[model samples]
Target: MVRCMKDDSKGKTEEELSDLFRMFDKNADGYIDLEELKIMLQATGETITEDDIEELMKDGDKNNDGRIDYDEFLEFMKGVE
Candidate 1:
């Protein structure tokens, strides 16, 4: 399931992130699977392939669960430069 927390400096509220997570989670299962991620990325006009989604899942699936939840996404964003 997706978790939520506020980022004061980024002004990213839990509600906003939760909303975005739900948008990407088409199945409404509380986790973003690789297919969901791929679809969301492509919908944003990024020509992402399955391999790309695999790489993203590899990087973001902190729990090694083959899926991404909001907490893992938060950790991933923290490493973004």
Candidate 2:
């Protein structure tokens, strides 16, 4: 089944795409690390390896901070668009 994004124009902009990344960054360390990614993927029954996670994170961590923040997450999602 395909999921849909709610129209942000009419609803809460407080939790836009950027908010999601912050929400996922549970530790509030300003970055979403590999361990978080692993838990997220695993929660959805998606098995991921350390190497795979590193590669994927590399693509998203635009600042090269060795982690993914709201900006990187936004960029990554924008790529999907």
Candidate 3:
């Protein structure tokens, strides 16, 4: 299945966010790193650059650990919506 992030995921349930995180978390490592994010964007046909990913992380990495966890991802998605 080729699941993509919802266009409006602001009010999504926990499970829905979890599913989206799992889809983008390529290594199943419990977090989405830069490479995984690149892949995720590519899957959506978005041509992104390293700077773009860094910009995304600015809002997505809540704790600023350099990776996006489920909570951070959800928050980021909400902002995107």
Candidate 4:
């Protein structure tokens, strides 16, 4: 089942944010990458641009790796939040 992030009172509350991160990491690869970022943002239906995705990828990748793990994802979401 496809789930979309809600924009109401459902703010990032640790566990919930982890859930969101997992949702983004669709392939269950234990990390998030460019395509995963695109899919998650697309799921939100938000008006995001390629630049926005680039920013996410840039900030999320701490070790300069193509994919971001859970810790990076948590920090990245917090930064966005």
Candidate 5:
């Protein structure tokens, strides 16, 4: 697939993504709840849709902890990119 010019889609890094992870954790919780993740992908982009979040929710919560940790978030988001 030809992934081309999308404003601000370039220059992504785990370091920055890490910063975003914590920033998106609005409740100051150690994990990212569903709502938090919604915000994450919004700031991330609308490349997501109903099934996207649904699927990500199913896949992202590997531990079934009902929330997403950085590693979990990293895997999904990193893979998405």
Candidate 6:
């Protein structure tokens, strides 16, 4: 029998999430583009393609402007894990 693991439920706080976004942003360009995210995920041996990163960032761009600011980034972080 297979068991589904439960989510942590305790979502990340705003401050922590903001820091995470900054850390990944690298260039501090106020955006986490495909190249940056691709490097991060790929470094972990994660088989993620550019399209995969784009799909994941869809919701992160809360303003629907296809850009992710710190706030939107935090919201997305909460949904992670």
Output the number of the lDDT-best candidate: 4
Q: Of models 4 and 6, which has the larger TM-score?
A: 6
lDDT of 1 by residue, 44-68 (tens): 7657677877987888888889898
lDDT of prediction 2:
0.72
* Ranking of all candidate structures by their TM-score, best first: 1, 3, 2, 6, 4, 5
Instruction: Give candidate 2's TM-score.
Output: 0.62
lDDT of 2 by residue, 8-73 (tens): 465545347766776677577777887787676665666667888788677787887778877777
Candidate 3, which ten residues in sequence have the lowest lDDT sum? 5-14
- Candidate 6 deviant stretches above 4 angstroms: 1-12, 78-81
Q: Give the per-residue lDDT of model 4 (tens digit) for 1-69.
A: 658855576555776765776667778878888887787788775699888898878877876887888
Best of the two (2, 4) by TM-score: 2
Better of 1 and 3 by lDDT: 3
TM-score of predicted model 1?
0.65
Off by over 4 Å in 3: 1-14, 77-81
**Each candidate structure's count of clashing pairs:** 0, 0, 0, 0, 0, 0
Task: Between candidates 3 and 4, name the one with more favorable TM-score.
Answer: 3
Identify the superior model by lDDT, candidate 2 or candidate 3: 3
* True lDDT of residue 20, candidate 3: 72
Q: What TM-score against the true fold does each predicted structure earn?
A: 0.65, 0.62, 0.64, 0.61, 0.50, 0.62
Model 2 per-residue lDDT at 78: 71
Evaluate residue 59 in candidate 4 and report its C-alpha lDDT on the 0 to 100 scale. Answer: 71
Give the per-residue lDDT of model 3 (tens digit) for 2-43: 588557646657557787777878788998778777777777
Residue 38 C-alpha lDDT in model 5:
74
